[PDB]
A paper describes a structure:
[name] ([name], RhoGEF and pleckstrin domain-containing protein 1) and its close homolog FARP2 were identified as guanine nucleotide exchange factors (GEFs) for RhoGTPases that play regulatory roles in neuronal development. [name] and FARP2 share a conserved domain architecture, containing a N-terminal 4.1, ezrin, radixin and moesin ([name]) domain, which is followed by a long linker (~200 residues) that connects to a Dbl-homology (DH) domain and two pleckstrin homology (PH) domains. We determined crystal structures of the [name] domains of zebrafish [name] (zfFARP1), mouse FARP2 (mFARP2) and zebrafish FARP2 (zfFARP2). As expected from their high degree of sequence identity (>60%), the structures of these [name] domains are very similar to one another, with root mean square deviations within 1.0 Å.
Numbering used by the authors: 38 to 282, 290 to 319
Write the structure that this text describes.
Amino acid sequence: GRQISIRVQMLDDTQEVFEVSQRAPGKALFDLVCSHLNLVEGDYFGLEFQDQRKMIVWLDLLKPILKQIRRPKNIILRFVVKFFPPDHTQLLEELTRYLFALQIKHDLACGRLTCNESSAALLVAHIVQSEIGDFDEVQCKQHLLNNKYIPEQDTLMDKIIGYHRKHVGQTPAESDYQLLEIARRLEMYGVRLHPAKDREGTRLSLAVAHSGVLVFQGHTKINAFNWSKVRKLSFKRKRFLIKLRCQDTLEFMMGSRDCCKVFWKICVEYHAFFR
């Protein structure tokens, strides 16, 4: 039950080091990171890391820390959004919105968030507005060459300039709000994909949202199974099972027995968070 030190990385590319008991629940560490950030609406967030199997796993806030930690000297947890709500104007804390805008900033660069060209330009133009202020032909075009917010940004540079000339006078807090309003309508918003194959042997991807379970081909949404139309979620070894209310039980082959367990957990945790 001794104390250990854990290095947590924040959404602003900074890192801190906290000290928690080994036998303490994950919630204890999660509380320290929230109070360090003065995060009042921390319910939307979580701590994720890569395990020994090199797959990114959430930190169980109910289980002990030493159960899910291996070498706290080498592992870096990262504070990330865990649940993306549908309504965005209700996020009371301006800081809470700010961490979300940072989150979208990250997903935009990783490729976890893709969208239409004009949408992507507008989303960047708000990020630029929040960071360097009002438009300036000299400063802006320079700033887009020193900072790459989306892959293949150079081809999209002219459109970002146009949108930036419109955001004049908007504060960074006003820009984060515009980020969320424009990002929350995106097909890939808050979407973290789990690869799978149907009985047809078709390479697809499954995900979960506030509305329910999602099915993607590449990055295009295929089906949506709302919680109202989802009877039971199950998994056997390397096959996922979705029972509907009753059509049939759609089977999905996934990568490993752990992949099913991971997706199964976040499906229950998503429904339990919105119902």
